[PDB]
Structure formats: C-alpha cells, structure tokens
Amino acid sequence: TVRKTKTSKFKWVRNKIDIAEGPGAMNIANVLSTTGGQTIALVGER
Amino acid sequence: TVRKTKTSKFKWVRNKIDIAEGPGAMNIANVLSTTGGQTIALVGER
Amino acid sequence: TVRKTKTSKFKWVRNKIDIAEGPGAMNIANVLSTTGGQTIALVGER
Amino acid sequence: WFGTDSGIARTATLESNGTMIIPPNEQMTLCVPYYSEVPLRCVKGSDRNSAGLGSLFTQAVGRTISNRVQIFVS
Amino acid sequence: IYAATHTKVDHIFGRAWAVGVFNTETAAIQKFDLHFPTSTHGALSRFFCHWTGELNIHILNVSTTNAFLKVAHTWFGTDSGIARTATLESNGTMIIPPNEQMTLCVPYYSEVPLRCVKGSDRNSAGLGSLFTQAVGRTISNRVQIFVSFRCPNFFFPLPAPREATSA
Amino acid sequence: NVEAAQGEELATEVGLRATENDGSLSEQLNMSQPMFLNFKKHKVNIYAATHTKVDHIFGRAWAVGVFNTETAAIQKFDLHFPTSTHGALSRFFCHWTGELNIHILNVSTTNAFLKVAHTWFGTDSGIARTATLESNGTMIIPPNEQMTLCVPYYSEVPLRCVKGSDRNSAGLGSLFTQAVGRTISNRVQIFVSFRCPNFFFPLPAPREATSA
Amino acid sequence: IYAATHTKVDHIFGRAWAVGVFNTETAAIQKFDLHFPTSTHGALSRFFCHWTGELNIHILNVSTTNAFLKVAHT
Amino acid sequence: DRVAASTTTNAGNLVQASVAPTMPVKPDFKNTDDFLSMSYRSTTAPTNPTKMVHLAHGTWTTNQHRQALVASITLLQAFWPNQDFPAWGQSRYFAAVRCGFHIQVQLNVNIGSAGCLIAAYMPKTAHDHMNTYTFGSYTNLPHVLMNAATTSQADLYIPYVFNHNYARTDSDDLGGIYIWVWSALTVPSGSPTTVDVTIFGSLLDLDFQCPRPPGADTVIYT
Amino acid sequence: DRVAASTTTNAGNLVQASVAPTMPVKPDFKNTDDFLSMSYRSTTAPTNPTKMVHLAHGTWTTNQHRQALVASITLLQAFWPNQDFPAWGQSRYFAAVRCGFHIQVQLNVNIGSAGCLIAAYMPKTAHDHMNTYTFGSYTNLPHVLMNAATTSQADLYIPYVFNHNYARTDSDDLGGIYIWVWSALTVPSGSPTTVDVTIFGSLLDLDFQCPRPPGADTVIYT
Amino acid sequence: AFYDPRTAGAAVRCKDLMEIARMPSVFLGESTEPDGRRGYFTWSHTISPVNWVFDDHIYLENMPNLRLFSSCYNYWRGSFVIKLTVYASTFNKGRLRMAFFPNREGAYTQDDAQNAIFVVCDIGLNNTFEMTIPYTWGNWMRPTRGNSLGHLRIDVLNRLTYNSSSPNAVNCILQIKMGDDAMFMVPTTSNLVMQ
Amino acid sequence: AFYDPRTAGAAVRCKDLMEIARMPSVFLGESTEPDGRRGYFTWSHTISPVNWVFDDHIYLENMPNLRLFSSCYNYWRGSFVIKLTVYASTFNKGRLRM
Amino acid sequence: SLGHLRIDVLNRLTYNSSSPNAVNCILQIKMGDDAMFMVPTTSNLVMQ
C-alpha cells in the first residue's frame, strides 16, 4: 500500500504473554489464597 | 429489540485471553523468581 | 561498555509471572463464571 | 439451529459451521449465538424445525475409541 | 438483525476451514501442499484471482505415544533452485507440544506480490507449502491442519466457477 | 541538452575511482555509488521490519544437536557456533559478546524431569566443578515440556571468538544436563538463539569444506 | 563488570542447592531432616552460627503412576 | 588535461587525459526548426508507439451458437506480432512492459439484425483455464455488452492487471480480450450473412525497462 | 449515444453511436510503480536511442604516410547500419532527421610514440569531392588535433549542418567524420606497431518526422 | 553485564550487518592461474579490437563473499556496483568496455553491444571503474540462488600498446560490490557446510 | 508487509464482498440451444397474445453466480432486481409483460 | 421455491421484410440493494 499510516499496526499485535511458576498446585495452609475462591452460589452472593 | 442502546454490549464481552510461554517450568538459579512465592504462613505474615 | 545509561535495562526484563490456583476446572453452578465465555459467533456479535 | 437437513445435506464437514476444538480430558464453556429463521423458539413442541433449541454435532479425531462425552446446557 | 455483518470480507474468512488430514509415523520431513479451499465456505474466495494477506494455520496434534511435532512454512516450494529443506529449524519453525494445538500465523513473504487463487501451478499459484516433522521416537502421531485468512485483500473478480463432477 | 552529460570535475560521480586511495574501509561505505543519466536510487521498504539488521536476524533460532538420554549421569554436551544454517551468517566475525537463549525440548515416553545447567568455563576450571550442577544455575524442566531460559555472559575472556574450536576461550559454551525420576529413553533437542549480539571486527568469507 | 553483585548476601543464597533425594513407595508419613548445606556453594554460609530468615523449599515430584504428594514443615 | 566523464541514458564514458571540446563558429544548438518545414509536433517520435492500430478482425455468422467465440486477441503480444506495427521497433529492445491498455471494439450491423457479442477481458492466470467458468457469469469481468442495433462502438479501458510487477513483452502475460456470442444474430432475407467484427485497439501509459539483445528472450519474474 | 472522437499521436478515430467506456472497480491508472521493482528512470525508453555507441574502429600503422586515411565514418547512416544499434529500431519508421551529433574520438598510444591524427568533419555536399582541397588547410574545418603523447580523448560537438532543412535517415546526407594522418608515428623497438583507433560516438537533440512504411525508402527534399 | 568493545578493534558495535555485503569480492577468484574466464584474467595484445577478453554468467553463488550470504537469505533487492580493475604501467595505454545484459545467457553476437549498459573507459593513473546496475524484475524481490543474473562481456576497443620498458600483457580483476540500497530477505537454511 | 494493490486492476481493496452478488447472472443459461425454459428463450410470432413464452420456477440454486454463493451461506434477505432483455431491430416492435 | 415468473404475449412480434422473424431473449437475476447473507455453512458440492 502506497498509503499506509505508521502505527503499532506494523506488528499486527498479539495476545499478551505470561509465565506460570507453580503449575496449578493447591495451597492449603495460607489463609490469603484460601479466602479467595470459586463460589457455587449463584452470582456469588453473600 | 426495536430499542437497544449501541454499546460494547453488541459483542457480549468475554473472559480475557492470554498465552503461556513456559508451561510452568520451575526456575532455581534466578533470585528474582525465587524471592516471590507461596507462603505456608497464615496470611503470609513476616 | 564504558558508556551505558543506568536504567531498568540492567536486568533485561522478562515475561510477567503468575500463579494458577485451579488448574482449569470448569464451574457449572456459579452464574458469574457462566455468563462470560467463548462465542462461536463470528466476532462475537449479539 | 437448522437440523441436519436445510434442504441440502450441510453436514458434509462441520469445520466451517463454527467448530470449536476440545482437548482430551478437558472441557470448555463455548456459547452459541442465536441464528434462526424463526425469531422465537417454542419450548413445548418437539417438532425438529422450529421447536427445539437446537441440534448438536460432534466427531472424534486421532484414531480412538471409548471417548466418552457429557454435555451440559445453560 | 445482527450487529456484526457476515457479508463483510473481514468477518467471513475468519471462520477457518479444514484442509487435509494425515498420520505421521516417520521423523522424515513431510511435504504437504496447501491449495485454496474447495467444497466449503472457503470456496467463496473462488471469485478472485489476485490475493494478498497473512494467513493463520491451526494445526492439531494427536499423539498416542508422547511426541513433539514441528511446523514450518515456506511460500517458495521445496525447490528455490537449491534444496532448502535440509533442516527446517531456521526458516521459522514453531514447536508444538503433544496433544496440543496452536494458532501460529504466517506473514506474507513472496517474490510475487499477488497470489492467484485459481491456478494449481506450484510456483506462484498456491497460497503455500507446509513442512513438518515429528520428534521423540514415535509413530502414529496424527495431525490435522486448518487454514484461516486474516484481513485478506482480494483483487479483481472472475465469473462464478463451474461445479466439477468429472474432476 | 537533455540526453548528454559532461565532465571534467564530477567524473568521480560517473564511477571513475582510484582503488589505491580507499581512505578507511569504512570510508568506502560513505561513497556514493555511480549513476548514469537514468537510474533511480530509492530505498523501498516492503516490510516494516528489516531482516538485514543484526538484532532481528539472529532472533530466529537454530538447531544444534540431538541426543537421547537413558542415564541419570551428568551429560557433557559442547556447543560450537552454528554451521550449515542461517547461523553460519555469524561466521564473518571473530569477537562476539552477548547473552544467548537456549531452547531445550524434552521428550519423555516414561515421565521424567530433566535439568539444564550452563557453564562458560568447561568441565575443568582446574578443579572438577561438575560434582553437582544444582548450584551453578540449574533450571528444572518438566516432562514433555520446553523452556526459553537464557544464559547471561560470564567469562574470563571478554570476547569469544567464533572461528576457533579451542575449548578454553573459543566456544560459546558447554552445556550440562541430567535426567531424574528413574527413567530411560528420555530424548532432548536443544536450540541456541542469540539475544542482542555484539559482533566485533570482520573476517573474510570462509571456504566451504567438502573434505572437513 | 556486572550491574548486580554476586558478593551481596541477598543475591548469593538466592541460587538454591540440592539436599537429599528419595523415592517413596509408601503412604506412611516420611521423616526427612534438613541439615545446613555441605559440599556446595551453600557451604559459604558455614561462616556464621546464628541465622534467622525464611527459607524456600523447592520440591520436585516424579511419578510413573499418577500420585499426589503432600509437603509440610515443622 | 583532467578526468572527464560522460553519461547518456544507459551508457557512460569515463575518460582520462581529456581535451576541451570544439564547436563550429557561432553555433546554434536549438533543436526545433523555426520557421518549420514540418507541421508535426516534435514529441511525435517517442509518442508514436502509442498510436492505435487495427487488431485481429473476426467473422461472426448465423451458424455460430451462444458461448461460441467470434475472435481472439492475446493482449500484450498483440501490438507487435509483426514488424509492421508502430510499437514493434521500440519493443524489440526493452524486455518488460508496465503499459496500460485502451481497446475500442468496432462493429457494424446492417439495421434490421439482432443479437449480441460480448467483449470481455481475461488476464493470463485466469485465461489458463476456460473449463472452470460458467458462461452465464462472464459479466463479472470488466466488459461491455454490444447490442446489434444502436451500438456503433464499444469503448473499454483496461488498467494494468497482472500477478508480477512487470510483464514480459514477447509473451502473453497480460492475457487478452476474447469476444463471445451472447445471443445468435437473426437475419431476414435478403441480407449479407457475415457480420464483420474488427477490434480496433490502442495503447496508453507507455513503459519499457530492462534492456536485452534485440532478438533474444530473457526471463525476469519466474 | 453521440459522436465520440479519439486521437492519439498520428492516428485518430471518429465514432458514431458510441457507448460510455468501462473500467474495473476502484481503478488506479497512475503509471509509475511505487514501490519500485526497477531502479531505472521511466523516461529511459524514449531516451534510449541517444545512447553513445562504438563506431567504425580503424588501424593506424607506421607504413601509412601523411594525408593518408586511418578510418572513415558516414555520419547519419552510422548510428543504425545494423539491427544491433539502439537507435535503429526507432529509426526504421520515421524518415527524416534533424538530430545533432556528439562524437568522442577514443585513442590509446603507448607512451614513447609520437605522431598525430586529425579528426575533422566534412558535410555531404563538401564530401562529394576530395580532389579540390589542399591538405595543409583542413584545419579550417571544425576539428580537433590529436597528439600521440598526452591526449587520451578528443571531444568534438557537431551541430546540425546541411543544405536542406531536414535530412534523410537511410542516406549519408549529414556527411561524416574522416580521420587523417597529420604526421607519421614513430616507433622505437620493441613496441606494438599497430595503434588502434576507435571512434566512440553518440547522439543528442533527437528528432524524427515524416512516417513511412518500415522498409521502404522515400524522397523528401530532392 | 557491561560489555567491553574497546578491547575489540572497533569501539562501536555493528548495528546492520549489511555493511559486510558492501565489501568487494573477487569474482570466482579461487584460481592461481591467470586465465581466462575465472574473473582473474589476462588482457593481451594478441587480440584485435572487439573480441572477448572475459565472458561468463555471474551467479550470485559464484562470488565468494555473498556465496554464504546467499545461502542464508532467499531473496534480495538493490543495485550492483561491479568494478573492473586493470594494473598497468603509467606508460601502457588502452581502452576496453564492459557490456552487461541483466537476465541473459549465451549472449550477444559479439557484434551487439548497444541496448545494454556499458562503460567505455581508459587505462591511466586511475584504474578501478565502478558501474551500477539496478535490479530488474517483474517481482518486488528476486530469488538469491537461482536463475542467471546475466552476462558481462569485456572486449577490446583498442589493443594494449606495449613499450620496450613496458609489460607485454596485464592481469585484471573483477569485483562485485553490493549496492547502496540492497536489502536481503526471509532467512533460510541451506545444505552447505561451514557456510 | 506493505501490500501492493496497484499491480492489481483495482487500486482500492474490496471491503464488502456483497458487491459481487450485485452482478447480474443469466438464469440457467448453461444451454447453447435457444429454447425454451432455459432462461435463454425465443420470442416468436407464431403465438397469439396471452400465451407463455417462458414459465419456470426460479430456485436460488439455478442461477450460476449465486449458486455457490448460496452454498456458502444458509440464509439471506433483501429484494431482487430481475431484468429481462430483448434484442431486436429498431424496426421490430411488440409488448410483453412479466 | 422462490416462485414463478411468467412471460406472456400482450402483442405478437410484428416482423418486417427487412426485419428478423423472431428474437432471442435473456433473463438475469441481479441481487438487490439491501440483501444480506447470513451464518456461513459448508455444502457437499465440489469446486464451488
């Protein structure tokens, strides 16, 4: 294209990339990790 | 619906999507990755 | 290099690191998790 | 949403109709948008044309047997 | 009736389509050639000769015995005038884990600025030629590969093609 | 008029040049190449990125070595600079310094963890430092999986030379591994990619070796 | 020569070190005692008597037959 | 006695130990001639190959049914098949063509006849196969319908359309215009049966590149 | 459905019952190609016949005395005697030449030889008779002397000079450059005897007029 | 780490490796013998005007420097600058020209020079003659190792004139310098070893 | 990469491919013979007023262009424009209705 | 079926001596202004 604007669109973007340390290992003891979690309530209401 | 507001609600949203590079491989040597980590303390206190 | 600027470029950066709790376990009951999800529509339109 | 027969057999290959591939020993939440020539589905009737809430297609790949599925509708 | 348009060029070819299935029991490099789509909604692209745009490739790995498989794409065929297929590591290889699949897309590298859909001539006509090999001493590693365009640019029309009963 | 052109001063521009005075070799880089009445010199970028730039070209990795490992004993594996690939484009330079990626790819029929550790100095630092590789920067790799871990530059020689095969300062490194988890036929494949290389000083284009 | 310092106490003990290897075929609770490091770069810590700080534990599970394993410290 | 360089078009001349040039006394180098012995414009010569030329006439009769082919023209090889054509001599050197195309289909039908020919345009890589195309759909192409009655001329402009950037002169690379029978003609008696069709072509946006020996072929894109 | 006229260069087309033209969807008729697949300038093709060309080399030895003729060039018929030359193909159509001339005499003498050749210019009506001219006076002509030592090249520009306004291509009408021995060369031993002389010509201020059938001659001025 | 360039010959790191392509390389210069098609050739006086001293195709794979540089990348653009070099006494004089048809084989008649790029030039106090050939294709890029890049012909305008104090015949060398704008594209492996 | 449209016939890329559907296509025109139901038919004077020259269903699958365009999409909306074309001398006159 | 179209004679073709006896006609279906297509789907046909 003779006419193309110069932007981040050169590089077509991507999905963002991350790294996982623990491969999904459950943690019992720690209260912080324990508090947050999936609810089987409907719309997680209290 | 004859009456619908035009918003991001056309596209019903989604969960955000990411990509994992390393599939959960542990790293020993590097101090940075080593420092952060799961605590077996209660509420991770020092 | 006799001439190097002092920045975050000492440490060469990295990919960001996260931890997964549930290793991809589906949740039926909860409405919140149920609402969001992958669409087989083209460009997820409503 | 239309059945096996749209007046032609459209089931020849299901790749183009919105296929979403599911890994082994795994499950996904994929939702279906509403595509129908009938703006309102009726719950009661069993008539395959406009009555049902849909018709579902699947096939296994990777030369296997005893691949068992279970399907949930929400 | 819908917010999005299924008629728009951008959207319609977003849906991928299945070209080819083969099992691979041998570590030898596999020549696999990609024709433009026939007998599917991809055949809607048969109206245009000249086409240019990058295209996705969804390969799907199935391994009874654990095997890694590699994917590499070359717009020029096996022969560039020399045999460049000696090792596919340097040409853009992207390694795929066992029982897994990836979305990797190929950028447009061609000495012909516009691919023509119709012709089968291996030089400039096809939309590409695909290379793979298994690793990890295995057999019956079976793959299936899907081709989806991304933001295609179609140039110039042609008349609607005849259905071929005689092939 | 339109067609003709004349001298006598600018005959430098029309391509007459004395090779005996080259200035610096880098001074020739500044030299404006000759042109006739009709030629259009225009730099046309077809791609946004440049494949010619040093940074980009060595981003593409290249495959050095394949071996199966059935034994828990520590594996000595030595890394030469690339031959017979696009990595061989690096053969123009002697002195090289920069950190380099290592992509190892684990294949295990029976489930096995495998460990990776790198040492710029060889097996012998004057003592045998290979007793256990845990402390030297080990990074553990899960079965049927692969990782991108990159090695920082630690060397008593500030500049590695590409050409030489001499184990002391010449190679770009020596790689250590061992399997764990009581297994056999654990097979690996290892890929080496540079990151932001610094190449110093050129050499002439090397001969292809038929006789090796 | 390097931005970071390998000499600093914080950094040097970041690199972990391997203490002990054992297979476990039995569900019975395993007593495993941790001595301070010998015969490694951890032995650099042998200069000091009194030590206080929290410590990481990297355990690595290898199971031919699928098995979950639990870790607890006292 | 210094270095003197000389450059014209492609050729160039690097001389050492030069001598200052000479010219006749009171020279006048102005090109044009005033007063003029020729009424033509001096830009004629380079422009000349653009001149429009008769191309590949054909004869369309009763007997020919629909989908039949009246006449055929291979576009890029059409303007200089022979030495007679104006663009030949200057195309016998340069090996590539970026040129655009102007083709005007001439036709004459005695009033009282009815039928249609269609003038289409098929690029090379399309032309490779006729067998694929439904006939009823040829109107997708850039084209012009021609009615027997009340159409004297059909004017269609074709921009350059081809895979490769430049196209080889001596080959068919641009494809070509093919003229098809849209419906049979209907003749009352008496009338002349054969209705003569002459495709009267032209050329515009002239371009040439990549010098070669006069008679030899050369590959470029493949 | 009206009267439509079309004119390009010489040819022209007067059509009745015209039809409005067609063009492919979103046409772009800009000639040049950006980005460029060719570094050349697009004005190359018409400019090309102006390119400088090797012309009629000759061999000047010891034995030849003064007033002898080294080599001969018939000026206007010189640039396209064969099909190989660049200006031939486009001169094989147009029958007249207003063109000016640029000729650079190339010569190489091994240092240690002494003598001179003279490059003169004789128009046709002058060239008709050699017998009239005293040799010692040839320097009246537009010319350049060439010393054996310390002359690499002799650059002379010749404006158009001829009786009639325009001159016929296929003929000798412009006359031609003739190179004469001003003094014998003197060779010490050992040396190569023959000193090769190549007249390396060119052309400028290109002009052509008066179209003709490709191979046929046509009279104009006589 | 903080890298140390100053130990190296060049203080500043090489950003683009294209600058290596710009370095001249003798065409097919692997031969010790002086003759005749090998890019190192002998200009002799035994030959009359208009006869080939040097005629051969030039593949991109013949020239030593770009030979590996060709195996690495599949495609390239950009003009040539190819330069002939004659070595002769200040006495010795003669003129030879270089005809080049891009994209040609088995070329010319030896009669037809024109309608092809050429540089007529003279031996003297100066020697190297550089001439630039823009790339020519219908494509927006070309295959690197592949079809012939076309002949260059070297013929006599004027035979070498030798003196008694001067050599009889001179030895010449061709060098292909890569152009200003020349890009390379889409890196690719090859079957060759050590390059 | 920067794509190059100008090499192609059309400078501007085709945004919507609907514009191909807008292109006319002869109904069931696969026949060389002139008659009689095939969409290419013969208007004759041998027939009195009010008699069929052409009568047939039109499936969306009969017309050549939309035939594949139909196989690609299951559903469609929107009006037709269907056009009859007679070719006759300026002399010849007659009236027919659809 | 999308429905019949019928073509009938209001007035027979009137032919002259200099004029053809019978004329050949052609139907063409042009798709409309507003026509959408929906929900892409495969079919059993080949090459289309």
Numbering used by the authors:
A (entry chain C), B (entry chain C), C (entry chain C): 4 to 49
D (entry chain A): 150 to 223
E (entry chain A): 76 to 242
F (entry chain A): 31 to 242
G (entry chain A): 76 to 149
H (entry chain B), I (entry chain B): 37 to 258
J (entry chain C): 50 to 244
K (entry chain C): 50 to 147
Quote the original article.
LV belongs to the Parechovirus genus and is closely related to human parechoviruses (HPeV) (∼48% amino-acid identity between the VP0 proteins).
Here we report the determination of an atomic model of LV from a 3.78-Å resolution cryo-EM analysis. There are very marked (∼20 Å high) protrusions displaced some 45 Å from the icosahedral five-fold axes, but otherwise the external surface is broadly similar to that of other picornaviruses; being relatively smooth it is most similar to HAV21, although less angular. LV uses the VP2 N-terminal domain swap across the icosahedral two-fold axis, first observed in a picornavirus for HAV21 (and seen in the insect picorna-like viruses), possibly imparting extra stability at this interface. The external surface of the LV capsid possesses unusual protrusions surrounding the five-fold axes, which extend the radius of the LV particle to ∼170 Å. Residues including Arg 6, Lys 7, Lys 9, Lys 12, Lys 14, Arg 49, Arg 62, Lys 64 of VP3 and Arg 225 of VP1 are engaged in interactions with the ordered RNA; of these, most of the VP3 residues are conserved across the genus, while residue 225 of VP1 is strictly conserved. Throughout the capsid the ordered RNA comprises some 900 bases, 12% of the viral genome. For other genera of the family, only occasional isolated bases have been observed.
